[PDB]
Design an enzyme around this catalytic site. Sequence first.
Site, mmCIF file in Angstrom:
data_model
loop_
_atom_site.group_PDB
_atom_site.id
_atom_site.type_symbol
_atom_site.label_atom_id
_atom_site.label_comp_id
_atom_site.label_asym_id
_atom_site.label_seq_id
_atom_site.Cartn_x
_atom_site.Cartn_y
_atom_site.Cartn_z
ATOM 1 N N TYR A 81 3.498 -0.444 13.597
ATOM 2 C CA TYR A 81 3.697 0.429 12.442
ATOM 3 C C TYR A 81 5.197 0.542 12.134
ATOM 4 C CZ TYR A 81 2.524 4.404 9.348
ATOM 5 O OH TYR A 81 2.305 5.284 8.309
ATOM 6 N N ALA A 128 1.921 5.617 -0.041
ATOM 7 C CA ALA A 128 0.644 5.113 0.456
ATOM 8 C C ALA A 128 0.836 4.276 1.713
ATOM 9 C CB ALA A 128 -0.041 4.256 -0.605
HETATM 10 N N1 LIG Z 1 4.732 13.281 9.688
HETATM 11 C C1 LIG Z 1 4.256 12.607 8.643
HETATM 12 O O1 LIG Z 1 3.324 12.998 7.949
HETATM 13 C C2 LIG Z 1 4.958 11.275 8.353
HETATM 14 C C3 LIG Z 1 5.938 10.819 9.216
HETATM 15 C C4 LIG Z 1 6.605 9.622 8.951
HETATM 16 C C5 LIG Z 1 6.282 8.882 7.821
HETATM 17 N N2 LIG Z 1 5.289 9.338 6.944
HETATM 18 C C6 LIG Z 1 4.923 8.526 5.757
HETATM 19 O O2 LIG Z 1 4.612 9.341 4.615
HETATM 20 C C7 LIG Z 1 3.627 8.642 3.828
HETATM 21 C C8 LIG Z 1 2.414 9.574 3.759
HETATM 22 O O3 LIG Z 1 1.980 9.930 5.074
HETATM 23 P P1 LIG Z 1 0.874 11.084 5.299
HETATM 24 O O4 LIG Z 1 1.251 11.786 6.552
HETATM 25 O O5 LIG Z 1 0.752 11.871 4.054
HETATM 26 O O6 LIG Z 1 -0.465 10.228 5.578
HETATM 27 P P2 LIG Z 1 -1.812 10.357 4.697
HETATM 28 O O7 LIG Z 1 -2.787 9.410 5.293
HETATM 29 O O8 LIG Z 1 -2.207 11.775 4.549
HETATM 30 O O9 LIG Z 1 -1.362 9.813 3.248
HETATM 31 C C9 LIG Z 1 -1.364 8.413 2.958
HETATM 32 C C10 LIG Z 1 -2.070 8.167 1.625
HETATM 33 O O10 LIG Z 1 -2.013 6.762 1.329
HETATM 34 C C11 LIG Z 1 -3.334 6.379 0.920
HETATM 35 N N3 LIG Z 1 -3.510 4.928 1.130
HETATM 36 C C12 LIG Z 1 -3.525 4.309 2.311
HETATM 37 N N4 LIG Z 1 -3.689 3.002 2.125
HETATM 38 C C13 LIG Z 1 -3.787 2.782 0.821
HETATM 39 C C14 LIG Z 1 -4.002 1.650 0.045
HETATM 40 N N5 LIG Z 1 -4.181 0.462 0.613
HETATM 41 N N6 LIG Z 1 -4.080 1.783 -1.282
HETATM 42 C C15 LIG Z 1 -3.958 2.972 -1.859
HETATM 43 N N7 LIG Z 1 -3.760 4.064 -1.151
HETATM 44 C C16 LIG Z 1 -3.671 4.009 0.183
HETATM 45 C C17 LIG Z 1 -4.234 7.193 1.848
HETATM 46 O O11 LIG Z 1 -5.554 7.260 1.294
HETATM 47 C C18 LIG Z 1 -3.550 8.552 1.757
HETATM 48 O O12 LIG Z 1 -4.012 9.277 0.613
HETATM 49 C C19 LIG Z 1 3.281 7.346 4.564
HETATM 50 O O13 LIG Z 1 4.051 6.245 4.077
HETATM 51 C C20 LIG Z 1 3.675 7.681 6.004
HETATM 52 O O14 LIG Z 1 4.066 6.499 6.710
HETATM 53 C C21 LIG Z 1 4.627 10.541 7.213
#
Ligand SMILES: NC(=O)c1ccc[n+]([C@@H]2O[C@H](COP(=O)([O-])OP(=O)(O)OC[C@H]3O[C@@H](n4cnc5c(N)ncnc54)[C@H](O)[C@@H]3O)[C@@H](O)[C@H]2O)c1
Lengths: 295, 295
Positions: free
Chosen positions: A137, A70
């Site tokens: 971030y 999250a």
């Molecule tokens: N390329 C990428 O997608 C990528 C790259 C680097 C890191 N990440 C990390 O992977 C993880 C998921 O990323 P993602 O791409 O799926 O983004 P995303 O926004 O699709 O998924 C994040 C989820 O966390 C939930 N969330 C956010 N804040 C919250 C809170 N306060 N309480 C409860 N839920 C909450 C959002 O509703 C969402 O469902 C994150 O930690 C992100 O930093 C992703």
Amino acid sequence: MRIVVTGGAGFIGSHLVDKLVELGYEVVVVDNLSSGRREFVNPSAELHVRDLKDYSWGAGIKGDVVFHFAANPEVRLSTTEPIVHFNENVVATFNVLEWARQTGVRTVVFASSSTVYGDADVIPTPEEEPYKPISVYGAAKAAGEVMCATYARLFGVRCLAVRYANVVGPRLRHGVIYDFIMKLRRNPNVLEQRKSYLYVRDAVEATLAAWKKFEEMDAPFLALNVGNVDAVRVLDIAQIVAEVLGLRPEIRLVGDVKYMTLAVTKLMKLTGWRPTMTSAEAVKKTAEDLAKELW
Amino acid sequence: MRIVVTGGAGFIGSHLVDKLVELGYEVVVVDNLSSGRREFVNPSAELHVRDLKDYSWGAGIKGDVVFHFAANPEVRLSTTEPIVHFNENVVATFNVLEWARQTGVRTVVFASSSTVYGDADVIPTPEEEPYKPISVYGAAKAAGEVMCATYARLFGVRCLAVRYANVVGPRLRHGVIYDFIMKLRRNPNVLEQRKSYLYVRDAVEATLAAWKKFEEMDAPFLALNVGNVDAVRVLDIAQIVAEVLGLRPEIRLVGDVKYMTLAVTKLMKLTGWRPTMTSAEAVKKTAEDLAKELW
Ligand SMILES: NC(=O)c1ccc[n+]([C@@H]2O[C@H](COP(=O)([O-])OP(=O)(O)OC[C@H]3O[C@@H](n4cnc5c(N)ncnc54)[C@H](O)[C@@H]3O)[C@@H](O)[C@H]2O)c1
Ligand SMILES: NC(=O)c1ccc[n+]([C@@H]2O[C@H](COP(=O)([O-])OP(=O)(O)OC[C@H]3O[C@@H](n4cnc5c(N)ncnc54)[C@H](O)[C@@H]3O)[C@@H](O)[C@H]2O)c1
């Protein structure tokens, strides 16, 4: 066992949940639905709409392992207020760690990011490189890592920190691929950095394979890069997206890391994992997936 | 110029304020008086009772440079709730950085700690050693450092992070020396780790000398160790305190770093600074100071 997945209603999280469900794990999803969607939640998973910014977000929630994914999406970092990045990443992560400590969670799989490296001096970037984030971030993810490692050494809450490069696939509602599709959808005739891209399927497999190996280890903390071995340029992605949509638009060039590619030698050596698609192939597939979802 | 000192009503902070006032600087003190005292505030300084945990703590407060020394005292780390360490260090520091960014503060002198190193593999410990904190407090200071360095690289808010070893002197109301005096005060007949100690006078001089040199540099961020070159054992301190009080009590042995000593080669080479007292001498002097204050 019972597995808790924060952000399990989001992009990577929902796909992670699907694989965990296929493996037979009892999955509990915790998501505030800020960027995630209920339609992405696996029917077999138990959804709990909670906000990790609240200290008592996990009241009544029990699990043996927690995949803390999250956070606000990693995109347009300069357009979001620093306080938001701080609260959704640093505060949320601390509250997850306290919950894990107080409930006796044995393992925390933290979704980190290549942004913790900032503009790395070495590329492909090895895990050894220090924290040099250039965005709030990235600093927040780095701070999350420091706290996780400390909770592992001090309270025994072991943690595997997965530093993801760019991950792409179905259900994606943010990022360069998404933005390009939405732009061409706005005007298919016109369309207004080099990074590594990994199809979500490969990212999930690598993550679970690393987790299994980590559970067979005794090290309190471990940081591992997860991404492709190659990379593609922005203009290449624009080209790929257009071809998928069968379009021929005019490309108009009008704290973000410019160049990024993580070294995955540690991951491959530890798990034998290997990507099934190149960066360009992952981008193409994702464009085809999103086409059916957005076009 | 106008200098803002958070925690300026505390131990190190009040002494820092006194020297800044002697130098002719216009000093503004911000302190919630949780562990600090109004009696320690220099008459020439302007006191503002605010709580750094509040995002708007600095409303109406302007300054060219900020010495962020506010935080809960570094002692009995295992007896205080993790959330307190987190809020008083990580959240407070982030709010200070946002205030600095939004008000145009040019320099942030952050009071860090040797605890960011945890149980260092190399002792004396050089600044090069990585973050390996074993306490929540240490993780919080490390996280504070990461955020400060990022704000320096991203927003131009330059930061000098001062990693202090143990500092002792007048006005001290916490730490081993204080505890021993209060114990003997309870029972002068009975009294129930190797670290470096620096008299507060030397600590302040080193800090200001480093700040001056930092302002003559162009590096966005700089971490520098500040402590003595030697160290003393717990039993030695107990001995020193007793002699000062003219007592001969019975010593009864009944996430805390066991051994600590920071390498100050960088500090000495950069500023020419040198300690005026050894660890044992700083402890003796402090005991004599506190004797008049507590005995
Ligand atoms: N390329 C990428 O997608 C990528 C790259 C680097 C890191 N990440 C990390 O992977 C993880 C998921 O990323 P993602 O791409 O799926 O983004 P995303 O926004 O699709 O998924 C994040 C989820 O966390 C939930 N969330 C956010 N804040 C919250 C809170 N306060 N309480 C409860 N839920 C909450 C959002 O509703 C969402 O469902 C994150 O930690 C992100 O930093 C992703
Ligand atoms: N040996 C040492 O004294 C030592 C060692 C390592 C690091 N440090 C650091 O030096 C700085 C000062 O330490 P100290 O020994 O003087 O402790 P101290 O408690 O005497 O001083 C801290 C000051 O910060 C104030 N404060 C705390 N929380 C606040 C808040 N939320 N808002 C406003 N003010 C707040 C306290 O009231 C106090 O006046 C701290 O950052 C501490 O981590 C000190």
